[PDB]
Enzyme design. Structure first.
Site, PDB file in Angstrom:
ATOM      1  N   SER A   1      -9.194  12.133   4.128  1.00  0.00           N
ATOM      2  CA  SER A   1      -8.449  12.679   5.263  1.00  0.00           C
ATOM      3  C   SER A   1      -9.133  12.315   6.641  1.00  0.00           C
ATOM      4  O   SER A   1      -8.832  12.252   7.620  1.00  0.00           O
ATOM      5  CB  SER A   1      -7.830  14.029   5.208  1.00  0.00           C
ATOM      6  OG  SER A   1      -6.812  14.275   4.061  1.00  0.00           O
TER       7      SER A   1
ATOM      8  N   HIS B   1      -9.126   9.036   7.413  1.00  0.00           N
ATOM      9  CA  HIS B   1      -7.725   8.833   7.971  1.00  0.00           C
ATOM     10  C   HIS B   1      -7.945   9.270   9.387  1.00  0.00           C
ATOM     11  O   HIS B   1      -7.125   8.578  10.102  1.00  0.00           O
ATOM     12  CB  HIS B   1      -6.641   9.565   7.296  1.00  0.00           C
ATOM     13  CG  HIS B   1      -6.590   8.832   5.775  1.00  0.00           C
ATOM     14  ND1 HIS B   1      -5.917   9.580   4.635  1.00  0.00           N
ATOM     15  CD2 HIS B   1      -6.848   7.796   5.083  1.00  0.00           C
ATOM     16  CE1 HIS B   1      -5.859   8.870   3.455  1.00  0.00           C
ATOM     17  NE2 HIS B   1      -6.473   7.776   4.083  1.00  0.00           N
TER      18      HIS B   1
ATOM     19  N   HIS C   1     -13.687  18.968   6.670  1.00  0.00           N
ATOM     20  CA  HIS C   1     -12.835  20.273   6.416  1.00  0.00           C
ATOM     21  C   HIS C   1     -13.186  20.943   5.044  1.00  0.00           C
ATOM     22  O   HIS C   1     -12.731  21.803   4.681  1.00  0.00           O
ATOM     23  CB  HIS C   1     -11.138  19.745   6.410  1.00  0.00           C
ATOM     24  CG  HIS C   1     -11.055  18.636   5.552  1.00  0.00           C
ATOM     25  ND1 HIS C   1     -11.060  17.303   6.110  1.00  0.00           N
ATOM     26  CD2 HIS C   1     -10.415  18.657   4.055  1.00  0.00           C
ATOM     27  CE1 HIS C   1     -10.789  16.626   4.887  1.00  0.00           C
ATOM     28  NE2 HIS C   1     -10.225  17.240   4.006  1.00  0.00           N
TER      29      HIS C   1
ATOM     30  N   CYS D   1     -14.276  13.724   2.793  1.00  0.00           N
ATOM     31  CA  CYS D   1     -12.983  13.414   2.053  1.00  0.00           C
ATOM     32  C   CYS D   1     -12.220  12.288   2.876  1.00  0.00           C
ATOM     33  O   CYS D   1     -12.428  12.031   3.940  1.00  0.00           O
ATOM     34  CB  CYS D   1     -12.212  14.821   2.139  1.00  0.00           C
ATOM     35  SG  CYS D   1     -10.502  14.636   1.475  1.00  0.00           S
TER      36      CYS D   1
ATOM     37  N   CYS E   1     -11.755  21.771  -0.733  1.00  0.00           N
ATOM     38  CA  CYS E   1     -10.702  20.811  -0.685  1.00  0.00           C
ATOM     39  C   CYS E   1     -10.466  19.712  -1.864  1.00  0.00           C
ATOM     40  O   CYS E   1      -9.412  20.110  -2.688  1.00  0.00           O
ATOM     41  CB  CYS E   1     -11.032  19.840   0.444  1.00  0.00           C
ATOM     42  SG  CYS E   1      -9.360  18.583   0.370  1.00  0.00           S
TER      43      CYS E   1
HETATM   44  C1  LIG Z   1      -5.444  10.736  -2.397  1.00  0.00           C
HETATM   45  C2  LIG Z   1      -6.063  11.876  -2.046  1.00  0.00           C
HETATM   46  C3  LIG Z   1      -5.420  13.033  -2.843  1.00  0.00           C
HETATM   47  C4  LIG Z   1      -7.613  11.904  -2.381  1.00  0.00           C
HETATM   48  O1  LIG Z   1      -8.040  11.542  -3.523  1.00  0.00           O
HETATM   49  P1  LIG Z   1      -9.413  10.915  -4.162  1.00  0.00           P
HETATM   50  O2  LIG Z   1     -10.480  11.493  -3.347  1.00  0.00           O
HETATM   51  O3  LIG Z   1      -9.314  10.808  -5.518  1.00  0.00           O
HETATM   52  O4  LIG Z   1      -9.145   9.332  -3.381  1.00  0.00           O
HETATM   53  P2  LIG Z   1      -9.354   7.865  -3.918  1.00  0.00           P
HETATM   54  O5  LIG Z   1      -8.732   6.649  -3.227  1.00  0.00           O
HETATM   55  O6  LIG Z   1     -10.835   7.974  -4.374  1.00  0.00           O
HETATM   56  O7  LIG Z   1      -8.712   8.092  -5.503  1.00  0.00           O
HETATM   57  C5  LIG Z   1      -7.485   7.384  -5.654  1.00  0.00           C
HETATM   58  C6  LIG Z   1      -7.677   6.368  -6.840  1.00  0.00           C
HETATM   59  O8  LIG Z   1      -6.330   5.562  -6.634  1.00  0.00           O
HETATM   60  C7  LIG Z   1      -6.702   4.216  -7.040  1.00  0.00           C
HETATM   61  N1  LIG Z   1      -5.755   3.221  -6.956  1.00  0.00           N
HETATM   62  C8  LIG Z   1      -5.559   2.571  -5.792  1.00  0.00           C
HETATM   63  N2  LIG Z   1      -4.575   1.618  -5.745  1.00  0.00           N
HETATM   64  C9  LIG Z   1      -3.796   1.982  -6.955  1.00  0.00           C
HETATM   65  C10 LIG Z   1      -2.883   1.418  -7.710  1.00  0.00           C
HETATM   66  N3  LIG Z   1      -1.958   0.421  -7.211  1.00  0.00           N
HETATM   67  N4  LIG Z   1      -2.574   1.827  -9.069  1.00  0.00           N
HETATM   68  C11 LIG Z   1      -3.330   2.703  -9.487  1.00  0.00           C
HETATM   69  N5  LIG Z   1      -4.533   3.246  -9.229  1.00  0.00           N
HETATM   70  C12 LIG Z   1      -4.561   3.064  -7.788  1.00  0.00           C
HETATM   71  C13 LIG Z   1      -8.266   3.860  -6.740  1.00  0.00           C
HETATM   72  O9  LIG Z   1      -9.045   3.242  -7.644  1.00  0.00           O
HETATM   73  C14 LIG Z   1      -8.695   5.282  -6.611  1.00  0.00           C
HETATM   74  O10 LIG Z   1      -9.760   5.677  -7.787  1.00  0.00           O
HETATM   75  C15 LIG Z   1      -5.700  12.284  -0.482  1.00  0.00           C
HETATM   76  O11 LIG Z   1      -6.199  11.186   0.252  1.00  0.00           O
HETATM   77  C16 LIG Z   1      -4.403  12.764  -0.148  1.00  0.00           C
HETATM   78  O12 LIG Z   1      -3.682  12.098   0.208  1.00  0.00           O
HETATM   79  N6  LIG Z   1      -4.314  14.257  -0.133  1.00  0.00           N
HETATM   80  C17 LIG Z   1      -3.154  14.701   0.421  1.00  0.00           C
HETATM   81  C18 LIG Z   1      -2.977  16.096   0.624  1.00  0.00           C
HETATM   82  C19 LIG Z   1      -3.608  16.439   2.070  1.00  0.00           C
HETATM   83  O13 LIG Z   1      -3.270  15.845   3.007  1.00  0.00           O
HETATM   84  N7  LIG Z   1      -4.358  17.733   2.084  1.00  0.00           N
HETATM   85  C20 LIG Z   1      -5.156  17.918   3.533  1.00  0.00           C
HETATM   86  C21 LIG Z   1      -6.575  17.855   3.116  1.00  0.00           C
HETATM   87  S1  LIG Z   1      -7.279  16.354   2.258  1.00  0.00           S
HETATM   88 ZN   LIG Z   2      -9.533  16.962   1.848  1.00  0.00          ZN
END
Ligand SMILES: CC(C)(COP(=O)(O)OP(=O)(O)OC[C@H]1O[C@@H](n2cnc3c(N)ncnc32)[C@H](O)[C@@H]1O)[C@@H](O)C(=O)NCCC(=O)NCCS
Ligand SMILES: [Zn+2]
Ligand SMILES: CC(C)(COP(=O)(O)OP(=O)(O)OC[C@H]1O[C@@H](n2cnc3c(N)ncnc32)[C@H](O)[C@@H]1O)[C@@H](O)C(=O)NCCC(=O)NCCS
Ligand SMILES: [Zn+2]
Ligand SMILES: [Zn+2]
Ligand SMILES: [Zn+2]
Lengths: 374, 374
Positions: free
Chosen positions: B48, B51, B67, B46, B174
């Site tokens: 995080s 990060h 996780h 994932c 998650c």
């Molecule tokens: C972003 C989270 C939810 C993960 O989501 P995901 O796995 O889908 O990440 P990913 O980057 O692949 O997806 C986000 C999407 O945003 C898109 N994107 C990027 N920039 C932009 C933009 N300017 N406009 C639109 N879309 C965008 C990307 O193409 C991507 O497909 C994660 O990082 C998070 O912030 N979780 C918060 C909750 C938390 O901390 N829990 C603890 C365990 S993770």
């Molecule tokens: Zn996660």
């Protein structure tokens, strides 16, 4: 003898920005199709009316302002069904058309027919029913209550109990219901919860009243002016606190006071900062903060969305989330069943003619609520 | 033959910031009072976790990260009641002690015993169960799933159906439940509503799946990368839109598309801007916007509280607002009753040993979800 024709009367006209109101003679046209006309008996002086004066609530001028009122119907237009001649009434600055997306929704109240977002200062049809010296004058929020006579669209007026003291129930037109509703309709305060109100003017006090109505065990009043505290404890505030007594910033104190955050916070001030404070001080996982007041300035705040991600909810409302025409007659009915008292909110009473005096008492922070009478 | 004694195994250790994971030999101490120990069968990669690598999710190093996982219990400590030897399980990065303010609350899930807010990188008791070359190594979120064996506190683990395909149901640890839950638990999407998802990675897709599960008539996917669109329509997205195709800013287009604003918007990206867009594009009177994703950077956003005052609600959550130990076994039960499919979220599968390869596939935006297997 006035039905169907023009009425000559006194009103309070604001000719331009940052000037006092002038008492002028006014011609009030008779009600057209689906319009009511009303003899004012009492109008409150609210903050938004002063914001019209400073030019910070932008509506077109000249204008008969005023939006918190009650009165009695003088006549009705064609096809009006909801009210009769002589019915006591409260104008509704937030309408209820009953037909828009918002009116049809079960949670919403900000009717799409409102004149708040991009004010036109007219009736629903695009024209004015007021002239002074032949110069037309705009309406305000489809109400315009600074006048012995007004005319409003049917969707901006509510019939009420034939016996209500109009000097008192006029507060349900805005300041009371904005605060009360923020607590019982919007936030949905629950039994035994811990509340925290920011700002202890009359809306804030009505919030406190709404928090006590719900069964809150703790109601923490916050204000920078000590002198507002007695009244708040009188209306139900179990505790008061003045941020300027402290070394630590107040969400930090409110957090340790509430054992890690309150259930419900309310911003009822209208600075920017205080909205952030109030959000922060509610419990990270399940707290709800409600924006009641805002500055009319319309500026942008700064905030960390970490505060939301932990589970917080941040919402707001106009007119305490109350659907206006459904709510006002039940809210007044609730006053006549004595399920809350309005006297505590009324600090000064004046004849309509000393409107300018009442506005001096709001600007100096001496009034909770001045009522002008006719 | 391993119960009650030290296990020598392989893990993925992050010795310091901005370096790849090294496969090291590890000593996993046996479970103490109220602790479980688990043979990993599958862990997801994932955001995080990445990060942690860039130093933008601050937890103490060195650390066994990871996780999102499932596995099988090897042994249990004293007085453990919720699980037995050999029970299939999913570690819970958000615990459920069942005893804090938050756990006792009916809406809350961010257990006060979490290691997210100010991470210690330990077990609940303040110590580590991992050594590499005699140097101790920290846990991550009370889980640490990048290892053939881990140990977690009882309040960070859930028993699941004895027959679940662990390669697939690990996503409930998650990414799936974070997105799905955002739609069905937090926002409470309703029949026939109009949804709008911002970000179409795997969490976003799980959001979409949660919006279709609820009976949404319209599910509008937003992303800047075209290539994410097929999959989203596959999972239920009725429409997709790429902001960079347009001249107008996207809340303006989404508002005219949705006839004056959507019922539910979701920010699942983690820039700042996109959170504001998503809030703005929901219907002014009764719209609900949900913050799912955030940047780990932790910075401050800029926003006009007029947006809230009209009646909007702005909220967020961790782990889709799901109370972790109650929810995971029912969420897995729901997979085995075939009330949603997980295959669409799984783009790449790898042996645990090519962990570094899987992290290359997230950083290049090629993976929706890489699964490491043992
Ligand atoms: C972003 C989270 C939810 C993960 O989501 P995901 O796995 O889908 O990440 P990913 O980057 O692949 O997806 C986000 C999407 O945003 C898109 N994107 C990027 N920039 C932009 C933009 N300017 N406009 C639109 N879309 C965008 C990307 O193409 C991507 O497909 C994660 O990082 C998070 O912030 N979780 C918060 C909750 C938390 O901390 N829990 C603890 C365990 S993770
Ligand atoms: Zn996660
Ligand atoms: C502020 C609103 C709610 C009116 O409230 P009220 O009548 O109580 O105004 P008032 O100034 O008297 O009360 C606010 C209180 O804040 C206190 N205060 C001022 N600064 C601070 C501060 N820094 N910290 C704490 N308290 C403060 C004042 O002492 C005062 O008691 C009103 O202006 C408003 O913003 N309404 C928004 C909704 C709307 O526009 N509806 C349309 C019809 S009004
Ligand atoms: Zn309406
Ligand atoms: Zn008002
Ligand atoms: Zn807990």
């Amino acid at each position: 003898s006035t039905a169907g024709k023009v009425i000559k009367c006194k009103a309070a006209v604001l000719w331009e920005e940052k000037k006092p109101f002038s008492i002028e003679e006014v011609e009030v046209a008779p009600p057209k199709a689906h319009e009511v006309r009303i003899k004012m008996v009492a109008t409150g002086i609210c903050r938004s009316d002063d914001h019209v004066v400073s030019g910070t609530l932008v509506t077109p001028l000249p204008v008969i302002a005023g939006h918190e009122a009650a009165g009695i119907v003088e006549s009705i237009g064609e096809g009006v069904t909801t009210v009769r001649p002589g019915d006591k009434v409260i104008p509704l600055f937030t309408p209820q058309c009953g037909k828009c997306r918002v009116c049809k929704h079960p949670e919403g109240n900000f009717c799409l027919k409102n004149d708040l977002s991009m004010p036109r200062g007219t009736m629903q049809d695009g024209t004015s029913r007021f002239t002074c010296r032949g110069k037309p004058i705009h309406h305000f929020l489809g109400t315009s209550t600074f006048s012995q006579y007004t005319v409003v669209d049917e969707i901006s007026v509510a019939k009420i109990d034939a016996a209500s003291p109009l000097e008192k129930v006029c507060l349900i037109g805005c300041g009371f219901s904005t605060g009360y509703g923020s607590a019982v309709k919007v936030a949905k305060v629950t039994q035994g919860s811990t509340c925290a109100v920011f700002g202890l003017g009359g809306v804030g006090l009505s919030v406190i009243m709404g928090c006590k109505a719900a069964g809150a065990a703790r109601i923490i009043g916050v204000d920078i002016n000590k002198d507002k505290f007695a009244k708040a404890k009188e209306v139900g505030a179990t505790e008061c606190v003045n941020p300027q007594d402290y070394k630590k910033p107040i969400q930090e104190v409110l957090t340790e006071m509430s054992n890690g955050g309150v259930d419900f916070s309310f911003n009822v001030i209208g600075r920017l900062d205080t909205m952030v404070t109030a959000l922060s001080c509610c419990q990270e996982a399940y707290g709800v903060s409600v924006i009641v007041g805002v500055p009319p300035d319309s500026q942008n705040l700064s905030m960390n969305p970490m505060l939301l991600l932990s589970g917080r909810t941040w919402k707001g409302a106009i007119f305490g989330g109350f659907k206006s025409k459904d709510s006002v007659p039940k809210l007044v009915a609730d006053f006549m069943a004595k399920k809350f008292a309005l006297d505590p909110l009324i600090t000064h009473v004046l004849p309509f003619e000393k409107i300018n005096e009442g506005f001096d008492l709001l600007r100096s922070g001496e009034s909770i609520r001045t009522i002008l009478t006719f």
